[PDB]
Amino acid sequence: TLKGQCIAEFLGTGLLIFFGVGCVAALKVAGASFGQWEISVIFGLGVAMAIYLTAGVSGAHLNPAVTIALWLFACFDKRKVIPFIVSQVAGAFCAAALVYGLYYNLFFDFEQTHHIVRGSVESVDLAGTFSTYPNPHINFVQAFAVEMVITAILMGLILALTDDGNGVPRGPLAPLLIGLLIAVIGASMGPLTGTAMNPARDFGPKVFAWLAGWGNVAFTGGRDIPYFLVPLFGPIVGAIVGAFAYRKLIGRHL
Amino acid sequence: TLKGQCIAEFLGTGLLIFFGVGCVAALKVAGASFGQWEISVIFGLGVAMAIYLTAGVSGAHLNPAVTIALWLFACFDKRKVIPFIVSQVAGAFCAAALVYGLYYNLFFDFEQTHHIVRGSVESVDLAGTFSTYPNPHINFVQAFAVEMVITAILMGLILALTDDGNGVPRGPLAPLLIGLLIAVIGASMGPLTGTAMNPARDFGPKVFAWLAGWGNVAFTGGRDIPYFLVPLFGPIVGAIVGAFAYRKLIGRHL
Amino acid sequence: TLKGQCIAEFLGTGLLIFFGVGCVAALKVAGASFGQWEISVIFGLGVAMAIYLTAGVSGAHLNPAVTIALWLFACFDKRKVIPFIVSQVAGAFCAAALVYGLYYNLFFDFEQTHHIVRGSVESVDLAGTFSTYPNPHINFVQAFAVEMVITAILMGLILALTDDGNGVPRGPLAPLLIGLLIAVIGASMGPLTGTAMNPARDFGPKVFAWLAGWGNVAFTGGRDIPYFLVPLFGPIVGAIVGAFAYRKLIGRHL
Amino acid sequence: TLKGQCIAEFLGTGLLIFFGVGCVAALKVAGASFGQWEISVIFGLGVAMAIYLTAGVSGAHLNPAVTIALWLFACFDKRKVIPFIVSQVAGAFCAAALVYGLYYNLFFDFEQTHHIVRGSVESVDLAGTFSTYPNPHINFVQAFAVEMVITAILMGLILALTDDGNGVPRGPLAPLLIGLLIAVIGASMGPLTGTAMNPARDFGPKVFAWLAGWGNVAFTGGRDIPYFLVPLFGPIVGAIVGAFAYRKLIGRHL
């Protein structure tokens, strides 16, 4: 049932945000030690768990970009597209609120101790606990290219890993492998844009952060062109390119 | 036989404590380098091994909260509940004593060198080698919420990973995946409460620490409200919520 | 079709370079924290993904040394050898350009801040983002021995992991295991030569770096004997020794 | 054939030493960054590869303690025991020489720079590249207890992971899981004795180090009672206890 699938997409997208935003909060306001690979693998494995938990019900999209791509290249029912996307964004938003609720005291004490005014340009760093912001050395277009390229890779390898006509079928290994994939994408490109590669994963938490006191910078990142647009559209375009590329360069040869 | 199952629960719960408490002792009194993810994955993988070693005999609960939940939602024989719980707590207690026995000299030399009086408020840090204590910035209720939420997630994903009616059956991958799950829970929430999520894993070692010289603070954590109550009840409530939620939101849709 | 296989070899070799060179760029010009094991496992897992993505089409060589060895000991069609090698080198070259394009600004800002003249001997460090260079304490012959030994091990274990007549068949685990293998080779020997073990992985990116401003040192490493020859021939010789050794010492006993 | 099996045991034991001693050399004389978990997982995964490479031929003992235990509790042919042990020790010795050969220059330059006299008490640290030595805070008996306990755990879980009558058969996952097991044992207890848990893994390299200039301290560790005896006998006793315990406490209940 569609209602059941939306609930699963809501929970699954929320789960991956819980683990992902959770470890970044630990890093930023709890003083926990994590390198780039550690934060990346925790997020990737968290996604794997979200898939194992929802694959049997909704097919585990947990990403607006994947939903749209599966509709354009995998015959996914277009009538379930928007319900899926709303469920995903809502799930991400709620999980972000939940993580903030559990780490509540650490955020304030950290802001007090380091004299950080929530909502100021300098608070964009802590807002980074919930969503992504560009590296100081790159611009809007540069960041857009990164998100596009990585989501194309994301979609392409997801189809490859779940394509039973490509080499030996992965079976129950698929979700795990998809998580490991997300881990290497995050570790190799994360310093540039935080590798959002998922509109719901970024927008939902940004809306929460906006409501929780970070204000307008939660959306703009303090840049001339509102940054939120990159994590919102870059992945959608990328996922489409990736799906197309797989069927044309790899599928058409299997 | 019940006697055989209790022995398995005793050994399995003891195994996961050996590895878990072992690496924390290495971190605290042996100067070994470990980040938050490293200590968490070692504990998670250790749990996986404990499951592979006991699944075929007792079903590998190794956690009072899981035993109680499987009794309320999985038709587990209520006559085996208490025997299982006593075996689990006893196993955790003995493994803690074993780890202390092997690291014995390092504890004393560390306390001597850093002028730490065992049993004082400041010794709660080393007592943390055996069990969990709250982050300095959060209170009793806050810590209770964390343990509840994470154990609900723990139970929910355990049912999902072992549910052959949900997506492609995991088979022998299940225990490993459950260990990886524990790893991401510990890495994303560990800075808050040490992610006990298991009454036997926390209480047994606390009793040992109490007997080994840490005294009353082993139980209270040096807080107004004795902390041990959180790791004791928070997980039980959480496991129940998690089991219920899985069958209602995911099971009823498979 | 050969055309389809060349495309797959081009994409697969390009993928492993994207992830590999990507994380090193993060380390060198983005200030990301990675230990030796982290950079090594990211590269190994990246290779695994490249295999899952191309195994069903070309058999996933993604390495000139492996192609040549499979031709000499696995009956691989010699008519596909050169097309495969050209595809591999081209793929590696393009992925290197792509990574440089995404990290563009960080390279220049880093060179400006640290007063590094691209093309000078001291820029060999940053050129190391794309390919391999010898440890300061070893010479040409010493580096040649390392690459030979590790590629022999690489080839030998690849045959062992994909040999269904050796123990229980790995099935879909094979690519993952091959990635983990590459990870341990890189972590245990990487400080010596960067463990190239693949002519295309090293030469293609070196040509790009040469074109991108690093000049002649990209090829020589600033050494009397042009270093590029080691990563070029050491692996080919090694792969052959490894293949031979497997069939004679392990295969002939199965 | 026995000759073929001895060759496999020689290569497999040599492989695990190559990776293991290799990464420690990187840590000690090449300045590579590795935490306790990283060095431990590299060694564990290296063992897994050694098993995948030799399981089909010899059954992959790669450890004198395991060979002796399988003879006493698994009906292993006693006529193959000594040939297996000699092959294992020889393999470990040769791999140690090989790693020293590749890192040759770094050892000398490090000793020159830090003014270390090879063979002196203070050189025991570098000798630790090849084999194990006790933590400064524990004595002979204490170290003996550690090796005994961990090898008992090692043997017990190896039987459990390879016992098709215990839960769902692991199949091709077994070797990997055994490697992960070795990883958690090394990470949780490594700071105490270096977790040798294998007579060949320790003695062979100690003999090499003795011959390579470290002299008598390679065997004694600079202690009153020659340390080499612990890694030599502690594991044998432990493996026997572990095998017995598994069949009595877990097997007899399956």
Ligand SMILES: CCCCCCCCO[C@@H]1O[C@H](CO)[C@@H](O)[C@H](O)[C@H]1O
């Ligand atoms: C799941 C529903 C979550 C609703 C949003 C709750 C946000 C609570 O967040 C609060 O927001 C206030 C207003 O910005 C700030 O002043 C407070 O500092 C902040 O704690």
Ligand SMILES: CCCCCCCCO[C@@H]1O[C@H](CO)[C@@H](O)[C@H](O)[C@H]1O
């Ligand atoms: C599915 C997602 C739809 C998003 C629609 C655009 C929402 C943009 O959100 C807007 O961002 C501005 C940034 O300057 C703020 O000033 C506004 O307050 C905010 O509403």
Ligand SMILES: CCCCCCCCO[C@@H]1O[C@H](CO)[C@@H](O)[C@H](O)[C@H]1O
């Ligand atoms: C497995 C059974 C374990 C029984 C408990 C052994 C505890 C030994 O621990 C000892 O306890 C003493 C009293 O608190 C302290 O004074 C010592 O410092 C401590 O080493």
Ligand SMILES: CCCCCCCCO[C@@H]1O[C@H](CO)[C@@H](O)[C@H](O)[C@H]1O
């Ligand atoms: C299954 C677990 C049952 C636990 C029952 C409660 C045991 C509490 O333990 C008590 O904690 C107090 C904390 O101030 C101490 O003062 C007491 O000495 C100690 O016995």
Ligand SMILES: CCCCCCCCO[C@@H]1O[C@H](CO)[C@@H](O)[C@H](O)[C@H]1O
């Ligand atoms: C995929 C095709 C890539 C072609 C090579 C593009 C290299 C762009 O690189 C440019 O090269 C110039 C000349 O060396 C340098 O002066 C510039 O600093 C550098 O950015």
Ligand SMILES: CCCCCCCCO[C@@H]1O[C@H](CO)[C@@H](O)[C@H](O)[C@H]1O
């Ligand atoms: C398949 C790979 C074929 C490589 C053929 C050799 C290419 C060597 O390349 C050469 O290296 C020299 C190093 O000093 C440079 O001076 C030259 O400019 C460069 O063309």
Ligand SMILES: CCCCCCCCO[C@@H]1O[C@H](CO)[C@@H](O)[C@H](O)[C@H]1O
């Ligand atoms: C595989 C066969 C290996 C045989 C042992 C080779 C040891 C080479 O090692 C050498 O040993 C000399 C004598 O101790 C030392 O003086 C040298 O410094 C050392 O490099």
Ligand SMILES: CCCCCCCCO[C@@H]1O[C@H](CO)[C@@H](O)[C@H](O)[C@H]1O
């Ligand atoms: C299978 C392994 C058999 C080992 C037999 C004992 C070998 C001990 O080796 C001995 O150790 C002494 C330590 O002080 C040294 O003085 C001797 O030179 C050395 O031969």
Ligand SMILES: [Mg+2]
């Ligand atoms: Mg690490």
Ligand SMILES: [Mg+2]
């Ligand atoms: Mg790791």
